[PDB]
């Protein structure tokens, strides 16, 4: 069962329930370490849809129909009873990518990258390749996904 919902023009409707998908890793790019303006502020919590997680465990590959959501959250504090560091605050928005060789035959890896203006937007905005795909293609460890930062994926593959 596919977890994306799409328009006739193959655009990703804003995913619902992705926090109940399979978490694959979190990173943090604080504003204060990125000239007071991180590209994706600031914590990133990343999810893969459950069907594609199942296929990943079987094959170590992203199936046609894979949806990955990167959820952004602010840095809420830098010190807690557990020590110094970064601790999350409030949610900021999402980014997403969808793999589909039928809908996206001309895109690298058959991935479409979606930006979201806000959580109330009805749909994502598909991006031209220089804005997202170029960086992922140049630097991601596996099939345009930064699996070097997803220890769940690396431990879960066969």
Q: Return the residue of 2, 10, 127, 152 that touches ligand HEC, per CB under 6 A.
A: 127
> In angstroms, what CA-CA distances link 143 with 38, 97, 104, 138?
25, 12, 15, 10
70: annotated binding-site residue? yes
Q: Considering only 8-16, 51-59, 76-84, 98-106, which stretch makes contact with ligand HEC by CB under 6 A?
A: 76-84
d(CA 116, CA 74): 17
Which one of ligand HEC, a second copy, none interacts with residue 153, CB within 5 to 8 A by kind? none
Which one of ligand HEC, a second copy, none interacts with residue 7, CB within 5 to 8 A by kind? none
Cβ atoms within 10 Å, residue 101: 12
Shortest reach from residue 10's CB to a second copy, in Å? 26
Q: Return the residue of 11, 12, 67, 68 that touches ligand HEC, per CB under 6 A.
A: 68
- Which of 2, 113, 94, 98 minimizes the C-alpha distance to 54? 2
Q: Considering only 14-22, 60-68, 102-110, 121-129, which stretch makes contact with a second copy by CB under 8 A?
A: 14-22
**Tokens at 91, concatenated:** 């949610």
Which one of ligand HEC, a second copy, none interacts with residue 132, CB within 5 to 8 A by kind? ligand HEC
Peptide bond into 32 cis (omega under 30): no
């Amino acid at each position: 069962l596919n977890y994306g919902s799409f328009t006739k023009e193959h655009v990703l409707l804003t995913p619902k329930g992705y926090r109940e998908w399979v978490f694959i890793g979190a990173s943090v790019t604080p504003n204060e370490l990125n000239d007071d303006k991180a590209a994706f502020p600031e914590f990133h919590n990343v999810y893969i849809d459950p069907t594609s997680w199942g296929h990943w465990k079987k094959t170590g590959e992203f199936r046609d129909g894979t949806v990955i959501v990167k959820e952004l959250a602010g840095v809420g504090s830098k010190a807690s009873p557990s020590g110094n560091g970064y601790f999350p605050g409030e949610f900021n928005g999402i980014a997403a990518m969808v793999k589909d060789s039928k809908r996206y035959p001309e895109r690298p890896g058959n991935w479409a990258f979606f930006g979201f203006e806000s959580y109330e937007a009805k749909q994502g905005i598909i991006q031209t390749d220089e804005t997202c795909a170029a960086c992922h293609k140049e630097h991601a460890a596996h099939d345009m996904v930064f699996t070097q930062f997803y220890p769940v994926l690396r431990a879960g593959k066969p």
